[PDB]
Amino acid sequence: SWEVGCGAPVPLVTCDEQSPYRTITGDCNNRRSPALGAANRALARWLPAEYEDGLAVPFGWTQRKTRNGFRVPLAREVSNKIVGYLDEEGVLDQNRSLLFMQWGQIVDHDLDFAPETELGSSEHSKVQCEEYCVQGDECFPIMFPKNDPKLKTQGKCMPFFRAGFVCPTPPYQSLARDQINAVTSFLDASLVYGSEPSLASRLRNLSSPLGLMAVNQEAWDHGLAYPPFNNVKPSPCEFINTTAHVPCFQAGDSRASEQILLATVHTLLLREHNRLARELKRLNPHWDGEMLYQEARKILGAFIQIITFRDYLPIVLGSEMQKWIPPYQGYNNSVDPRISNVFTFAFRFGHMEVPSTVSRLDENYQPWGPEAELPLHTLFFNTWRIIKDGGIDPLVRGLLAKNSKLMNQNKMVTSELRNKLFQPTHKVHGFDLAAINLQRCRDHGMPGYNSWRGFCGLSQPKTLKGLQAVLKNKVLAKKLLDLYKTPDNIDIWIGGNAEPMVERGRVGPLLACLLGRQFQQIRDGDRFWWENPGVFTEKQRDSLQKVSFSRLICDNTHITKVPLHAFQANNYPHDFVDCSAVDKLDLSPWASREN
Numbered sequence: 001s002w003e004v005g006c007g008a009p010v011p012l013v014t015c016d017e018q019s020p021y022r023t024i025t026g027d028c029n030n031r032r033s034p035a036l037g038a039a040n041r042a043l044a045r046w047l048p049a050e051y052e053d054g055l056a057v058p059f060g061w062t063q064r065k066t067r068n069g070f071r072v073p074l075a076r077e078v079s080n081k082i083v084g085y086l087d088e089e090g091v092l093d094q095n096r097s098l099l100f101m102q103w104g105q106i107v108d109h110d111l112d113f114a115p116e117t118e119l120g121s122s123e124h125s126k127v128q129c130e131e132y133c134v135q136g137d138e139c140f141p142i143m144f145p146k147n148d149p150k151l152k153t154q155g156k157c158m159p160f161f162r163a164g165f166v167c168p169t170p171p172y173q174s175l176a177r178d179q180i181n182a183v184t185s186f187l188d189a190s191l192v193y194g195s196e197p198s199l200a201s202r203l204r205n206l207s208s209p210l211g212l213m214a215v216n217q218e219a220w221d222h223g224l225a226y227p228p229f230n231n232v233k234p235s236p237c238e239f240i241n242t243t244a245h246v247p248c249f250q251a252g253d254s255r256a257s258e259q260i261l262l263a264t265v266h267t268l269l270l271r272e273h274n275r276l277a278r279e280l281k282r283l284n285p286h287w288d289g290e291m292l293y294q295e296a297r298k299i300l301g302a303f304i305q306i307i308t309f310r311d312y313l314p315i316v317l318g319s320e321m322q323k324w325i326p327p328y329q330g331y332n333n334s335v336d337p338r339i340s341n342v343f344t345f346a347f348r349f350g351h352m353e354v355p356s357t358v359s360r361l362d363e364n365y366q367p368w369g370p371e372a373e374l375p376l377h378t379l380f381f382n383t384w385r386i387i388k389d390g391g392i393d394p395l396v397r398g399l400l401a402k403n404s405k406l407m408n409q410n411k412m413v414t415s416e417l418r419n420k421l422f423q424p425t426h427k428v429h430g431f432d433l434a435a436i437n438l439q440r441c442r443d444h445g446m447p448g449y450n451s452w453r454g455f456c457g458l459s460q461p462k463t464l465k466g467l468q469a470v471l472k473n474k475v476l477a478k479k480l481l482d483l484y485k486t487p488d489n490i491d492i493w494i495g496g497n498a499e500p501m502v503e504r505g506r507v508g509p510l511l512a513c514l515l516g517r518q519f520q521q522i523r524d525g526d527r528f529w530w531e532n533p534g535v536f537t538e539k540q541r542d543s544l545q546k547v548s549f550s551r552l553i554c555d556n557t558h559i560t561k562v563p564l565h566a567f568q569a570n571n572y573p574h575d576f577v578d579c580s581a582v583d584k585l586d587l588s589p590w591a592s593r594e595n
């Protein structure tokens with residue numbers, strides 16, 4: 001097709017080839033092609049990219065250039081008309097805890113990140129795009145439709161910058177533009193440890209030979225650790241509160257502080273690593289720091305894998321689970337473990353699971369203080385509410401006792417995200433995640449809804465009436481066809497999420513196929529999959545079998561009352577048990593005999 005190995009990634013990689021541990025970058029996982037699944041490479045293309053010029057320009061870039069004979073509608077107009085809603089009453093998922101939404105964001109951050117291009121440290125373009133809304137090069141602003149309230153209060157557009165792409169960072173015109181995945185495709189806790197050697201080391205505590213991750217020295221959570229602050233400026237977490245001056249955290253993944261409950265979950269996983277490394281020291285006093293770090297890292301990675309595949313994916317995929325992710329059959333080196341470009345949009349189904357508020361709960365799981373419940377938007381890049389307002393525990397209780405938002409054809413994305421999103425370097429709580437998602441679909445050259453329907457062996461509606469039948473919704477289908485004149489033009493993010501949910505699941509048939517295929521691949525094609533014979537010992541695997549998010553909480557907070565099944569909707573005190581009833585991770589099988 002085109003250069004089979006296009007230039008400008010890191011070349012200085014040598015594979016140990018016998019190391020019992022994953023690299024940080026993901027390289028060396030697949031022995032026959034060591035770059036597969038490695039960070040900072042092109043996202044995989046399950047289907048050829050679709051750009052208006054066939055190479056790099058997104059559909060919607062040139063006003064006259066149609067898609068299949070029709071103009072593509074403004075991202076912000078699709079957002080207003082279809083995505084938005086007013087009434088938060090009744091939107092909550094009766095049988096999914098708030099943790100269910102949160103774990104999805106965690107897994108997503110482990111698997112993919114396509115960062116915005118750089119090309120201007122001294123950049124004024126950064127200001128030309130934001131101030132003047134003039135589209136050029138990497139600046140691809142989201143223009144407001146006429147009648148948009150933001151036009152009255154926010155100017156002519158929301159700034160938006162095109163995703164980074166492989167080889168040159170300046171645009172290339174021989175083959176199709178490929179966006180970068182900056183994190184490791186393997187489900188491997190890279191959101192905790194980093195995907196770059198440079199970060200992985202800064203995150204570590206190399207002052208003591210105990211294999212610990214560095215912790216905050218400024219602040220403590222009633223004797224429990226926080227992540228270290230990221231001390232680089234300008235910091236958006238300091239920006240959102242001038243007076244508090246609390247910086248964002250520094251985790252293995254840069255997005256850790258985007259919202260308080262993500263920072264919260266990252267805090268729990270950091271604690272788990274240090275806890276694991278302490279127990280591993282007790283059992284093996286002869287183990288050096290590097291061994292301790294690696295062995296703890298490897299345990300945490302298995303923890304993430306098991307929670308994800310045993311607890312999370314079955315309640316996302318429902319009846320489709322078995323169809324796409326059959327019981328494990330061992331490592332298959334013929335499988336491409338790379339995250340596909342389309343998956344990074346498919347996994348965005350989580351955006352419709354996010355509720356409008358976040359609660360802090362006390363020991364009786366009752367409102368913690370007068371302002372117990374807060375609007376989600378005041379919690380973007382908010383670390384001060386953690387450090388200066390009771391720590392992680394009240395937030396973890398809310399994660400357990402409150403519900404995710406239920407996806408709803410008439411109520412897709414809360415205005416907390418739709419109208420009030422805060423983006424770093426940008427000053428207002430006035431962005432639209434839904435518009436961004438749609439603009440990004442186009443930025444990434446996504447094939448349309450029907451191309452993916454075909455990919456998944458599903459019917460391809462061509463008329464209003466066909467789309468009504470597929471979506472089981474007359475009003476939604478009319479709105480979609482009014483804006484997109486053919487279902488062929490419907491951006492995949494909105495198309496996939498518009499479909500009614502499969503039995504015992506939380507996504508439609510199209511998404512279950514795109515997600516199902518991807519997760520099957522990341523598992524089957526991972527040489528370090530926790531259940532691949534030889535990765536762990538059989539005795540170790542028996543111990544790992546009993547990990548639970550309930551136990552993670554017990555072990556790493558001062559919560560003593562937890563539900564057995566943390567992802568379902570649980571109410572206190574009935575669905576909650578004392579931690580003493582909860583299975584523990586038995587680290588005995590990690591005892592390594594020297595004599």
Ligand code: HEM
Nearest residue numbers: 101104105108112113114259344347348350351354436440
């Ligand atoms: C704030 C945001 C969230 C919570 C309050 C949130 C939540 C999720 C969940 C629950 C997801 C999956 C179950 C999920 C997936 C992906 N997101 Fe999202 N998300 C918040 C905010 C953002 C923002 C901002 C972005 C970047 C948008 C852009 O295109 O510029 C974002 C992205 C993604 C994403 C793509 C990641 C990538 O590969 O680059 C998901 C797979 N989220 N989020």
Ligand SMILES: *[C@@H]1O[C@H](CO)[C@@H](O[C@@H]2O[C@H](CO)[C@@H](O)[C@H](O)[C@H]2NC(C)=O)[C@H](O)[C@H]1NC(C)=O
Nearest residue numbers: 240241242243244245246378384385387388389
């Ligand atoms: C910024 O953070 C500060 C510091 O926590 C918040 O100020 C606190 O707010 C209430 C008063 O309404 C008090 O209970 C705290 O003691 C205050 N501290 C101080 C130093 O004033 C403030 O509410 C935050 N501001 C914003 C805009 O989020």
Ligand SMILES: *[C@@H]1O[C@H](CO)[C@@H](O)[C@H](O)[C@H]1NC(C)=O
Nearest residue numbers: 205207208210212213214215
């Ligand atoms: C490094 O580990 C030592 C020993 O456990 C501890 O005293 C110190 O606080 C740690 N430093 C960081 C930055 O985590």
Ligand SMILES: *[C@@H]1O[C@H](CO)[C@@H](O)[C@H](O)[C@H]1NC(C)=O
Nearest residue numbers: 329331332333334335336524
């Ligand atoms: C391994 O994966 C390849 C390609 O994805 C597939 O054709 C083959 O069936 C797989 N092997 C097994 C044993 O499933």
Ligand SMILES: *[C@@H]1O[C@H](CO)[C@@H](O)[C@H](O)[C@H]1NC(C)=O
Nearest residue numbers: 094095096315565567568569
């Ligand atoms: C709640 O969800 C779980 C799976 O998470 C399922 O087993 C159970 O039947 C559900 N309850 C109801 C009432 O649907």
Ligand SMILES: [Ca+2]
Nearest residue numbers: 110184186190
């Ligand atoms: Ca990863």
Ligand SMILES: [Zn+2]
Nearest residue numbers: 221222223558
């Ligand atoms: Zn305490």
